[PDB]
Coordinates of C-alpha atoms and ligand atoms in Angstrom, one line a residue:
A1 CA 0.0 0.0 0.0
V2 CA 3.0 2.4 0.6
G3 CA 5.3 1.7 -2.3
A4 CA 7.7 3.0 -5.0
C5 CA 6.9 4.2 -8.5
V6 CA 7.7 1.6 -11.2
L7 CA 9.0 4.5 -13.5
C8 CA 10.9 7.1 -11.4
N9 CA 10.9 5.3 -7.9
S10 CA 9.2 8.3 -6.1
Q11 CA 7.3 6.9 -3.1
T12 CA 3.5 7.1 -3.4
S13 CA 0.2 5.7 -2.2
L14 CA -0.9 5.8 -5.9
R15 CA -1.2 2.5 -7.9
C16 CA -2.9 1.9 -11.3
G17 CA -6.0 -0.2 -10.8
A18 CA -6.5 -0.8 -14.5
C19 CA -3.0 -2.5 -14.9
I20 CA -3.1 -6.3 -14.5
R21 CA -0.1 -6.0 -12.1
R22 CA -1.4 -2.9 -10.2
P23 CA 1.9 -1.0 -10.3
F24 CA 2.8 1.7 -7.7
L25 CA 2.8 5.1 -9.6
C26 CA 3.9 8.6 -8.5
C27 CA 1.8 11.8 -9.1
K28 CA 3.9 12.8 -12.2
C29 CA 3.9 9.4 -13.9
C30 CA 0.3 8.4 -12.8
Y31 CA -1.0 11.5 -14.6
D32 CA 1.0 10.8 -17.8
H33 CA -0.4 7.2 -17.7
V34 CA -4.1 8.0 -17.1
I35 CA -4.2 10.9 -19.6
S36 CA -2.5 8.8 -22.3
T37 CA -4.3 5.4 -21.9
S38 CA -7.8 3.8 -21.3
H39 CA -6.4 3.2 -17.7
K40 CA -8.3 5.7 -15.5
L41 CA -8.7 3.7 -12.2
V42 CA -6.2 5.1 -9.6
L43 CA -5.9 3.2 -6.3
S44 CA -4.3 4.3 -3.0
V45 CA -5.4 3.2 0.6
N46 CA -9.0 4.1 -0.6
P47 CA -9.7 4.0 -4.3
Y48 CA -10.3 7.1 -6.4
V49 CA -14.0 6.6 -7.0
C50 CA -17.0 8.8 -6.3
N51 CA -17.9 8.5 -2.6
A52 CA -21.5 9.8 -3.3
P53 CA -24.0 6.9 -2.9
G54 CA -24.8 4.8 -5.9
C55 CA -22.4 6.8 -8.1
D56 CA -20.3 4.8 -10.6
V57 CA -17.7 7.4 -11.5
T58 CA -14.2 5.8 -11.3
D59 CA -12.4 7.9 -14.0
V60 CA -9.7 9.9 -12.2
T61 CA -10.0 12.7 -14.8
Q62 CA -13.7 13.2 -13.8
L63 CA -13.0 13.2 -10.0
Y64 CA -12.3 15.8 -7.3
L65 CA -11.2 16.2 -3.6
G66 CA -14.1 17.1 -1.3
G67 CA -12.1 17.9 1.8
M68 CA -10.7 14.5 2.5
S69 CA -13.1 12.4 0.3
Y70 CA -13.5 12.0 -3.5
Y71 CA -16.5 13.0 -5.8
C72 CA -17.3 13.4 -9.5
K73 CA -18.2 16.6 -11.4
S74 CA -22.0 16.0 -10.5
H75 CA -21.4 15.4 -6.7
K76 CA -18.3 17.4 -5.7
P77 CA -18.8 20.2 -3.0
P78 CA -18.1 24.0 -3.8
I79 CA -14.6 23.8 -2.4
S80 CA -13.1 20.9 -4.4
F81 CA -9.9 20.4 -6.4
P82 CA -9.6 18.2 -9.5
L83 CA -7.6 15.0 -8.7
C84 CA -6.2 15.3 -12.3
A85 CA -4.6 18.7 -13.0
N86 CA -1.1 20.4 -13.4
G87 CA 0.7 17.3 -14.7
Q88 CA 0.0 15.4 -11.5
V89 CA -2.6 13.1 -9.9
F90 CA -3.3 14.1 -6.2
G91 CA -1.3 11.8 -3.9
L92 CA 1.1 11.6 -1.0
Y93 CA 4.7 12.8 -1.4
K94 CA 3.9 15.1 -4.4
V103 CA 6.7 7.1 -20.0
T104 CA 5.3 6.5 -23.6
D105 CA 7.0 3.0 -23.3
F106 CA 5.4 2.2 -19.9
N107 CA 2.0 3.0 -21.4
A108 CA 2.6 0.6 -24.3
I109 CA 3.7 -2.3 -21.9
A110 CA 0.7 -1.6 -19.6
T111 CA -2.0 -1.8 -22.4
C112 CA -0.6 -4.2 -25.0
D113 CA -2.1 -7.7 -25.5
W114 CA 1.4 -9.3 -26.1
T115 CA 0.3 -10.8 -29.5
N116 CA 2.7 -8.5 -31.6
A117 CA 6.5 -8.8 -31.9
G118 CA 6.8 -5.0 -31.2
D119 CA 5.5 -5.7 -27.6
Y120 CA 8.5 -8.0 -26.9
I121 CA 10.9 -5.6 -28.6
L122 CA 9.8 -2.8 -26.3
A123 CA 10.0 -5.2 -23.2
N124 CA 13.8 -5.5 -23.9
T125 CA 14.7 -2.0 -25.1
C126 CA 13.0 -0.2 -22.2
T127 CA 14.7 0.7 -18.8
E128 CA 15.5 -2.1 -16.3
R129 CA 12.5 -1.5 -14.1
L130 CA 10.3 -1.5 -17.2
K131 CA 11.8 -4.8 -18.3
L132 CA 10.6 -6.3 -14.9
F133 CA 7.1 -4.6 -15.2
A134 CA 6.9 -6.0 -18.8
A135 CA 8.1 -9.5 -17.8
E136 CA 5.6 -9.6 -14.8
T137 CA 2.7 -8.2 -17.0
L138 CA 3.4 -10.6 -19.9
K139 CA 3.6 -13.7 -17.6
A140 CA 0.3 -12.6 -15.8
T141 CA -1.3 -12.2 -19.3
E142 CA 0.0 -15.7 -20.5
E143 CA -1.5 -17.4 -17.3
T144 CA -4.9 -15.7 -17.5
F145 CA -5.0 -16.5 -21.2
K146 CA -4.7 -20.2 -20.3
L147 CA -8.0 -19.9 -18.3
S148 CA -9.7 -19.3 -21.7
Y149 CA -9.7 -22.9 -23.1
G150 CA -11.9 -26.1 -23.3
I151 CA -11.9 -29.1 -20.8
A152 CA -11.0 -32.6 -22.2
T153 CA -12.9 -35.5 -20.6
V154 CA -11.6 -39.1 -21.1
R155 CA -14.4 -40.7 -23.1
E156 CA -12.6 -44.1 -23.6
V157 CA -9.2 -45.9 -22.8
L158 CA -7.9 -48.2 -25.6
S159 CA -4.5 -49.3 -24.2
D160 CA -1.5 -48.0 -22.1
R161 CA -0.4 -45.3 -24.6
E162 CA -3.7 -44.6 -26.4
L163 CA -7.1 -43.0 -25.5
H164 CA -10.2 -41.0 -27.0
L165 CA -11.3 -37.5 -25.6
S166 CA -14.5 -35.5 -25.5
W167 CA -14.0 -31.7 -25.6
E168 CA -15.9 -28.7 -24.2
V169 CA -18.2 -27.0 -26.7
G170 CA -17.9 -23.2 -27.0
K171 CA -14.3 -23.1 -25.8
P172 CA -11.2 -23.5 -28.0
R173 CA -9.1 -26.7 -28.0
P174 CA -5.4 -26.2 -27.3
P175 CA -2.7 -27.6 -29.7
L176 CA -1.8 -31.2 -28.6
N177 CA 2.0 -31.3 -28.2
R178 CA 4.3 -31.8 -25.2
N179 CA 4.5 -27.9 -25.3
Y180 CA 1.2 -27.6 -23.4
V181 CA 1.3 -29.6 -20.0
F182 CA -2.2 -30.4 -18.7
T183 CA -2.9 -31.1 -15.1
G184 CA -5.0 -34.3 -14.6
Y185 CA -8.0 -34.5 -12.2
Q194 CA -5.7 -34.6 -8.7
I195 CA -3.8 -37.4 -10.6
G196 CA -0.7 -35.6 -11.8
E197 CA 0.5 -33.7 -15.0
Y198 CA -0.2 -35.4 -18.4
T199 CA 0.7 -34.5 -22.1
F200 CA -0.9 -35.4 -25.6
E201 CA 0.2 -36.5 -29.2
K202 CA -1.8 -37.8 -32.3
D207 CA -9.3 -40.6 -33.8
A208 CA -6.3 -42.2 -31.9
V209 CA -4.4 -39.9 -29.5
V210 CA -1.6 -40.8 -27.1
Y211 CA -1.7 -40.0 -23.3
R212 CA 1.5 -39.3 -21.4
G213 CA 1.2 -39.3 -17.7
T214 CA 4.1 -38.0 -15.6
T215 CA 2.6 -40.0 -12.7
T216 CA 1.4 -43.5 -13.9
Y217 CA -2.3 -44.1 -13.2
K218 CA -4.9 -46.4 -14.9
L219 CA -6.5 -43.7 -17.3
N220 CA -9.9 -43.1 -15.6
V221 CA -12.8 -42.4 -18.0
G222 CA -14.9 -39.4 -16.8
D223 CA -11.9 -37.8 -15.1
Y224 CA -11.0 -34.6 -17.0
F225 CA -7.9 -32.3 -17.4
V226 CA -7.3 -28.5 -17.0
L227 CA -4.2 -26.4 -18.3
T228 CA -1.4 -25.7 -15.8
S229 CA -1.8 -22.1 -14.7
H230 CA 0.7 -21.0 -12.0
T231 CA 0.6 -17.7 -9.9
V232 CA 2.9 -14.9 -11.3
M233 CA 5.0 -13.7 -8.4
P234 CA 6.3 -10.1 -8.4
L235 CA 9.9 -9.5 -9.7
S236 CA 12.3 -7.6 -7.4
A237 CA 15.9 -8.3 -8.7
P238 CA 17.1 -7.0 -12.2
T239 CA 17.4 -9.3 -15.3
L240 CA 21.2 -8.4 -15.2
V241 CA 23.0 -7.1 -12.1
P242 CA 25.0 -3.8 -12.7
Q243 CA 28.3 -4.8 -14.4
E244 CA 31.5 -4.6 -12.4
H245 CA 35.0 -4.9 -13.9
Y246 CA 37.7 -6.0 -11.5
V247 CA 41.5 -5.5 -11.6
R248 CA 42.2 -9.1 -10.4
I249 CA 40.3 -12.3 -10.0
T250 CA 38.0 -11.5 -7.1
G251 CA 36.8 -14.0 -4.5
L252 CA 37.9 -17.0 -6.6
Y253 CA 41.2 -18.9 -6.2
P254 CA 42.6 -20.4 -9.4
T255 CA 44.9 -23.5 -9.9
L256 CA 48.4 -23.8 -11.6
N257 CA 47.7 -27.6 -12.3
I258 CA 45.0 -26.8 -14.9
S259 CA 44.7 -30.0 -17.0
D260 CA 45.7 -29.5 -20.7
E261 CA 42.1 -30.4 -21.7
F262 CA 40.8 -27.0 -20.2
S263 CA 44.0 -25.0 -21.1
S264 CA 42.2 -23.3 -24.1
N265 CA 39.6 -21.9 -21.7
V266 CA 42.0 -20.6 -19.0
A267 CA 42.2 -17.0 -20.3
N268 CA 38.4 -16.9 -20.4
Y269 CA 38.0 -18.5 -16.9
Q270 CA 40.3 -15.6 -15.7
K271 CA 38.0 -13.1 -17.5
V272 CA 35.1 -14.7 -15.5
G273 CA 36.9 -13.8 -12.1
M274 CA 37.6 -10.2 -13.3
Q275 CA 34.0 -9.3 -14.1
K276 CA 30.7 -9.4 -12.0
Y277 CA 29.0 -11.2 -15.0
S278 CA 30.2 -12.5 -18.4
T279 CA 28.5 -13.7 -21.6
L280 CA 29.6 -16.7 -23.6
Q281 CA 28.4 -17.4 -27.2
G282 CA 28.8 -21.0 -28.0
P283 CA 27.6 -22.2 -31.4
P284 CA 26.6 -25.9 -31.6
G285 CA 29.3 -28.3 -30.4
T286 CA 31.9 -25.6 -29.5
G287 CA 32.3 -26.9 -25.9
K288 CA 29.8 -25.0 -23.8
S289 CA 29.2 -27.9 -21.2
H290 CA 33.0 -28.5 -21.2
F291 CA 33.7 -24.8 -20.6
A292 CA 31.1 -24.6 -17.7
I293 CA 32.5 -27.8 -16.0
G294 CA 36.1 -26.8 -16.6
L295 CA 35.5 -23.5 -14.9
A296 CA 35.0 -25.7 -11.6
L297 CA 38.4 -27.3 -12.2
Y298 CA 39.9 -23.9 -12.7
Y299 CA 38.4 -22.4 -9.4
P300 CA 38.4 -25.7 -7.5
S301 CA 37.4 -24.2 -4.1
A302 CA 34.5 -22.2 -5.6
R303 CA 30.9 -23.3 -4.9
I304 CA 29.1 -23.3 -8.3
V305 CA 25.4 -23.4 -8.9
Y306 CA 24.6 -24.7 -12.4
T307 CA 21.2 -23.6 -13.7
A308 CA 19.1 -23.6 -16.9
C309 CA 15.3 -23.3 -17.7
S310 CA 14.9 -26.9 -18.8
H311 CA 15.5 -30.2 -17.0
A312 CA 17.3 -31.6 -20.1
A313 CA 19.7 -28.6 -20.1
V314 CA 20.5 -29.1 -16.3
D315 CA 20.9 -32.9 -17.1
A316 CA 23.4 -32.2 -19.9
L317 CA 25.5 -30.2 -17.3
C318 CA 25.1 -33.1 -14.8
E319 CA 26.4 -35.6 -17.5
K320 CA 29.4 -33.5 -18.2
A321 CA 30.1 -32.9 -14.4
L322 CA 29.8 -36.7 -13.7
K323 CA 33.0 -37.1 -15.8
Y324 CA 35.3 -34.3 -14.4
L325 CA 33.9 -33.4 -10.9
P326 CA 33.8 -35.4 -7.7
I327 CA 30.3 -37.2 -7.4
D328 CA 30.3 -36.5 -3.7
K329 CA 30.0 -32.7 -3.9
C330 CA 27.3 -32.9 -6.6
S331 CA 23.6 -32.5 -6.0
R332 CA 20.8 -32.4 -8.5
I333 CA 17.9 -30.3 -7.0
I334 CA 14.5 -31.9 -8.0
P335 CA 11.2 -30.1 -7.2
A336 CA 8.8 -31.8 -4.8
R337 CA 6.2 -31.8 -7.7
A338 CA 8.5 -34.1 -9.8
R339 CA 7.1 -33.7 -13.3
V340 CA 9.2 -35.7 -15.9
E341 CA 12.2 -38.1 -15.3
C342 CA 15.7 -36.5 -14.9
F343 CA 19.3 -37.1 -13.8
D344 CA 19.6 -39.9 -11.1
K345 CA 23.4 -40.1 -10.3
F346 CA 23.9 -37.2 -7.8
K347 CA 22.6 -37.0 -4.2
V348 CA 19.1 -35.4 -4.6
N349 CA 18.1 -32.1 -2.9
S350 CA 21.3 -31.5 -0.9
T351 CA 21.3 -27.7 -1.4
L352 CA 24.6 -27.4 0.5
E353 CA 26.9 -29.6 -1.8
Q354 CA 29.6 -27.6 -3.6
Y355 CA 28.1 -28.2 -7.1
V356 CA 24.3 -27.7 -7.3
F357 CA 22.6 -28.5 -10.5
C358 CA 19.0 -27.2 -10.6
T359 CA 16.3 -25.7 -13.0
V360 CA 15.5 -21.9 -12.5
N361 CA 11.9 -22.6 -11.2
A362 CA 13.3 -24.9 -8.4
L363 CA 16.3 -22.7 -7.4
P364 CA 16.5 -22.5 -3.6
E365 CA 17.3 -19.3 -1.7
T366 CA 21.1 -19.6 -1.6
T367 CA 24.5 -17.9 -2.4
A368 CA 27.4 -19.0 -4.6
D369 CA 31.0 -18.0 -5.7
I370 CA 29.9 -18.6 -9.4
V371 CA 26.5 -19.1 -10.9
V372 CA 26.5 -20.7 -14.4
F373 CA 23.2 -20.1 -16.4
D374 CA 23.2 -22.3 -19.5
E375 CA 21.0 -22.4 -22.7
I376 CA 20.6 -18.6 -22.3
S377 CA 18.6 -18.1 -25.6
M378 CA 15.8 -20.2 -23.8
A379 CA 15.6 -17.8 -20.9
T380 CA 13.0 -15.1 -20.6
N381 CA 13.6 -11.8 -18.7
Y382 CA 11.3 -13.3 -16.0
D383 CA 13.8 -16.2 -15.6
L384 CA 16.8 -13.8 -15.6
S385 CA 15.2 -11.8 -12.8
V386 CA 14.3 -15.0 -10.7
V387 CA 17.9 -16.1 -10.9
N388 CA 19.2 -12.8 -9.6
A389 CA 16.5 -12.9 -6.8
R390 CA 17.2 -16.5 -5.5
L391 CA 21.0 -16.6 -6.0
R392 CA 23.4 -14.0 -4.6
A393 CA 26.8 -14.7 -6.4
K394 CA 30.3 -13.2 -6.6
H395 CA 30.3 -14.0 -10.4
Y396 CA 27.5 -14.8 -12.9
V397 CA 28.2 -16.6 -16.2
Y398 CA 25.6 -16.7 -19.1
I399 CA 26.2 -19.5 -21.6
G400 CA 24.2 -20.0 -24.7
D401 CA 23.8 -18.9 -28.3
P402 CA 21.4 -16.2 -29.7
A403 CA 21.6 -18.1 -33.1
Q404 CA 19.6 -20.9 -31.4
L405 CA 15.9 -21.3 -30.4
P406 CA 14.3 -19.0 -27.9
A407 CA 11.6 -19.8 -25.3
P408 CA 8.2 -20.2 -26.9
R409 CA 6.0 -17.0 -26.7
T410 CA 2.5 -18.5 -26.5
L411 CA 0.7 -15.2 -26.9
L412 CA 2.9 -14.0 -29.9
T413 CA 1.1 -14.5 -33.2
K414 CA 2.0 -11.4 -35.3
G415 CA 5.6 -10.7 -36.3
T416 CA 8.9 -12.5 -35.7
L417 CA 10.9 -12.2 -32.5
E418 CA 14.6 -11.4 -33.3
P419 CA 17.5 -12.8 -31.2
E420 CA 18.4 -9.4 -29.8
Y421 CA 15.0 -9.4 -28.2
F422 CA 15.0 -12.9 -26.6
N423 CA 16.2 -11.5 -23.2
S424 CA 18.7 -9.0 -21.8
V425 CA 21.7 -11.4 -22.2
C426 CA 20.9 -12.1 -25.9
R427 CA 20.3 -8.3 -26.4
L428 CA 23.9 -7.8 -25.1
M429 CA 25.3 -10.6 -27.2
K430 CA 23.8 -9.3 -30.4
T431 CA 24.5 -5.5 -29.7
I432 CA 27.9 -5.2 -28.0
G433 CA 28.9 -8.8 -28.7
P434 CA 29.6 -11.6 -26.2
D435 CA 32.5 -11.4 -23.8
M436 CA 33.6 -14.8 -24.9
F437 CA 33.0 -16.7 -28.2
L438 CA 33.8 -20.5 -28.7
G439 CA 34.9 -20.3 -32.4
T440 CA 35.6 -24.0 -33.3
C441 CA 32.9 -26.6 -33.9
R442 CA 34.0 -30.1 -32.9
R443 CA 30.8 -31.9 -33.6
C444 CA 29.7 -31.3 -37.2
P445 CA 30.9 -32.3 -40.6
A446 CA 32.5 -29.3 -42.3
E447 CA 29.5 -29.1 -44.8
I448 CA 27.2 -28.3 -41.8
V449 CA 29.7 -26.0 -40.2
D450 CA 30.3 -24.0 -43.4
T451 CA 26.5 -23.6 -44.0
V452 CA 25.6 -22.3 -40.4
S453 CA 28.8 -20.2 -40.1
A454 CA 27.7 -18.2 -43.1
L455 CA 23.9 -18.3 -42.2
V456 CA 24.1 -17.1 -38.5
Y457 CA 27.7 -16.6 -37.3
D458 CA 29.0 -14.1 -40.0
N459 CA 31.8 -16.6 -40.9
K460 CA 33.4 -16.7 -37.4
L461 CA 32.6 -20.4 -36.7
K462 CA 35.3 -22.7 -37.9
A463 CA 35.0 -26.5 -38.7
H464 CA 37.2 -28.9 -36.7
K465 CA 35.9 -32.0 -38.5
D466 CA 36.6 -32.5 -42.3
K467 CA 33.7 -32.6 -44.8
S468 CA 32.1 -36.0 -44.0
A469 CA 30.7 -36.5 -47.6
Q470 CA 27.6 -37.7 -45.9
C471 CA 25.6 -34.5 -45.9
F472 CA 22.8 -34.5 -48.6
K473 CA 20.1 -32.1 -49.7
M474 CA 17.0 -32.8 -51.8
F475 CA 14.6 -30.2 -53.1
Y476 CA 11.1 -31.7 -52.9
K477 CA 7.9 -29.6 -52.1
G478 CA 5.6 -32.7 -51.9
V479 CA 2.1 -32.3 -50.5
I480 CA 1.3 -30.3 -47.3
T481 CA -1.6 -31.6 -45.2
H482 CA -2.6 -30.2 -41.8
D483 CA -3.6 -31.8 -38.4
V484 CA -5.3 -28.8 -36.8
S485 CA -2.2 -26.5 -37.5
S486 CA 0.8 -28.9 -37.1
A487 CA 1.8 -29.9 -40.7
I488 CA 2.4 -33.2 -42.4
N489 CA 4.2 -33.8 -45.7
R490 CA 3.8 -37.5 -46.5
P491 CA 5.6 -37.3 -49.9
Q492 CA 8.7 -36.0 -48.1
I493 CA 8.5 -39.0 -45.7
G494 CA 8.1 -41.2 -48.8
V495 CA 11.3 -39.7 -50.2
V496 CA 13.0 -40.6 -46.8
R497 CA 11.6 -44.2 -47.0
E498 CA 13.0 -44.6 -50.6
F499 CA 16.4 -43.2 -49.4
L500 CA 16.5 -45.7 -46.4
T501 CA 16.0 -48.7 -48.7
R502 CA 19.1 -47.4 -50.7
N503 CA 21.2 -46.3 -47.7
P504 CA 20.4 -48.7 -44.9
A505 CA 23.3 -47.4 -42.8
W506 CA 21.0 -44.4 -42.3
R507 CA 18.7 -46.8 -40.3
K508 CA 20.5 -45.5 -37.2
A509 CA 19.3 -41.9 -37.9
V510 CA 17.1 -39.6 -35.8
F511 CA 14.2 -38.1 -37.8
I512 CA 13.9 -34.4 -37.2
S513 CA 11.2 -32.0 -38.5
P514 CA 9.7 -28.6 -37.4
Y515 CA 6.2 -30.2 -36.7
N516 CA 5.2 -33.0 -34.3
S517 CA 2.5 -34.2 -36.7
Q518 CA 5.2 -34.8 -39.4
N519 CA 7.3 -36.6 -36.7
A520 CA 4.2 -38.7 -35.7
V521 CA 3.7 -39.9 -39.3
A522 CA 7.4 -40.5 -39.9
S523 CA 7.6 -42.6 -36.7
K524 CA 4.9 -44.9 -38.0
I525 CA 6.1 -45.0 -41.7
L526 CA 10.0 -45.1 -41.1
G527 CA 10.2 -46.4 -37.6
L528 CA 13.1 -44.0 -36.9
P529 CA 13.2 -42.2 -33.5
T530 CA 11.6 -38.8 -33.8
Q531 CA 12.5 -35.3 -32.5
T532 CA 11.1 -31.8 -33.3
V533 CA 13.8 -29.2 -34.0
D534 CA 12.9 -27.4 -30.7
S535 CA 13.3 -30.6 -28.5
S536 CA 16.5 -31.6 -30.4
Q537 CA 18.3 -28.4 -29.1
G538 CA 21.4 -29.4 -27.1
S539 CA 21.4 -33.0 -28.3
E540 CA 23.7 -34.7 -30.9
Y541 CA 23.3 -37.8 -33.1
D542 CA 25.5 -39.4 -35.7
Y543 CA 22.9 -39.2 -38.4
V544 CA 20.0 -36.8 -38.9
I545 CA 17.2 -36.9 -41.4
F546 CA 15.4 -33.6 -41.7
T547 CA 12.2 -32.9 -43.7
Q548 CA 11.4 -29.2 -43.7
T549 CA 7.6 -30.2 -44.2
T550 CA 6.5 -26.6 -45.3
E551 CA 8.0 -23.1 -46.4
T552 CA 6.3 -21.2 -43.5
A553 CA 8.2 -18.5 -41.5
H554 CA 8.3 -21.3 -38.7
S555 CA 10.0 -23.9 -40.9
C556 CA 12.2 -21.2 -42.5
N557 CA 13.4 -19.6 -39.2
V558 CA 17.2 -19.3 -39.5
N559 CA 17.6 -20.2 -35.7
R560 CA 15.4 -23.3 -36.1
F561 CA 17.3 -24.2 -39.4
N562 CA 20.7 -23.7 -37.5
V563 CA 19.6 -26.1 -34.7
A564 CA 18.2 -28.6 -37.0
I565 CA 21.3 -29.2 -39.2
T566 CA 23.9 -28.8 -36.3
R567 CA 22.4 -31.9 -34.5
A568 CA 24.5 -34.3 -36.8
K569 CA 28.1 -35.6 -36.1
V570 CA 28.5 -37.7 -39.2
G571 CA 25.8 -37.3 -41.9
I572 CA 22.6 -35.4 -42.6
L573 CA 19.8 -35.7 -45.2
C574 CA 17.8 -32.5 -45.7
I575 CA 14.5 -32.7 -47.7
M576 CA 13.8 -29.1 -48.4
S577 CA 10.7 -27.0 -49.3
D578 CA 12.4 -23.5 -49.3
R579 CA 14.6 -22.8 -52.3
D580 CA 16.5 -20.2 -50.3
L581 CA 17.7 -22.5 -47.4
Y582 CA 18.1 -25.4 -49.9
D583 CA 20.5 -23.2 -52.0
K584 CA 22.4 -22.2 -48.8
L585 CA 22.9 -25.9 -47.8
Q586 CA 26.6 -26.7 -48.8
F587 CA 25.6 -30.4 -49.2
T588 CA 25.7 -32.9 -52.1
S589 CA 22.3 -32.6 -53.9
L590 CA 20.4 -35.9 -54.5
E591 CA 18.0 -36.6 -57.5
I592 CA 14.4 -38.3 -57.6
Ligands
ZN601 ZN1 7.4 8.4 -11.4
ZN602 ZN1 -2.4 1.2 -16.0
ZN603 ZN1 -20.6 11.2 -8.5

């Protein structure tokens, strides 16, 4: 009730009652907000509303001060002052961008652009507002009731009439009813219960909507440059394996925070784990937004770090299966691996935040609020996939607008850049280096002569809105009969419906481009499926082709990306 202005920090009893987050506003900023937007409800201890009985005047521009009470133009006493006048709204202790964040629906790319170009406090107001909007939007959907249960990984659902049906993919995690979280995939659909329970007919599901907590800490702490490695104690017995990263681990101790751009297979996990061998006495908290990203840090630490000082923090509401080799929930072990949502209230000598393109500004702020560290390291790549923006339907979100860290990496450049790709055949490295890394990524492997491209538009069908291209899967089927070594390939496509069809027709294991991020496979078979802005996204294309160690087959729809692929072309 007695707070600080989310724009100029001036203390005030004023708050905007029309803002979903009800931000505290000072007299100067409250005025400029109410006179420029549809937001006219001002709240303090008592709201600014006509105190005359039965009067429904809540607009602060149509209200006055009747001694110590508030009344409209039709009820005010002779001696009464307008609440709104002289560039201020009457309050104790007597912006174009704030207005846009406050009133937008978050469906345009320009909303997210502003949420990252604004001041630091407006980045937090934007991140809070956006998340509150995303959760409340979930409430507006239709309930799925289990009509029948065929088998253990198959069922038929009945949907609510008059309310939209959400897209069935592991993107949307439904809460079953209180029989745990479940997911769906294609009238034969597949049910995926995080908690195993004999699929009860009649029992319904409802979308997971969690409470948006206020943000206190900034997305990025104020940068500090030090003259010497501060609060960290390095070794002289640094193993040759991590010798290449020594000069950068030193940079990490001479800065409050540091950014690392690591293209696919340049050694991000290796760099993060090697930083623990360089500052061996330092307590390191390893974080990321996904469980799979934290598990990739756990797999790398298992090899170089002592398994006794390692703890994988698992939230009590254990959703899907994760890393099982460290002592679970020991917050005090020297190395703590944990997702951002599960981060306990603790301190560290170094905090390593991996897969930074997947972080939102809400996540950047949570980390600064739960972990007080001497040094913060942000590892990732703005040329890879960002976190899905469910409300965004108009415009394309650029990497410099994913979050504060990506904005920095794309504007002033990253502090550190891992320039040599050790995973991919040179054909893949040469293609993505020119596409998203302005020729700064270098190939370590030779050309494998196992990277192929085929131009085939096929036939695009649609399962609600996820696309299928059966003739492209047919081309893969014909390729596999001629190249049976490719039987050990992972099938990748931008759509789960294409993946669902290819799983039944080819029998290859399946992965969408988005779920393949961070993983590597000897052979990849990619069917673009469509030429949409989704399937043509350069970050998604980059992730797709950089999953392969040995060979890749790309069946393309877009002439542009097909011509850009530095692969052997195949006929048929
Ligand atoms: Zn102000
Ligand atoms: Zn407002
Ligand atoms: Zn009135």
